[PDB]
Design a protein around this ligand. Structure first.
Ligand SMILES: [Ca+2]
Ligand SMILES: [Ca+2]
Length: 65
């Protein structure tokens, strides 16, 4: 759906600043029960990080999904 991707981003962007950071991504994964390192989180971000800022914006997130 389109409204589902909008809702998902809103939930992962902990501070609501418009960007999902590595810390935020690591945080949700850890709460779900994943054991991960910052290196693992970085690889995930590299798969979505188009403009190369190290974080995931809304546009990048939707592409990712
Ligand atoms: Ca954020
Ligand atoms: Ca980015």
């Amino acid at each position: 759906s389109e409204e589902e991707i909008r809702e998902a981003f809103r939930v992962f962007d902990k501070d609501g600043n418009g960007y999902i950071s590595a810390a935020e991504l690591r945080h949700v994964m850890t709460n779900l029960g994943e054991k991960l390192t910052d290196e693992e989180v970085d690889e995930m971000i590299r798969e979505a990080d188009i403009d190369g800022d190290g974080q995931v914006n809304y546009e990048e997130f939707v592409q990712m999904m």
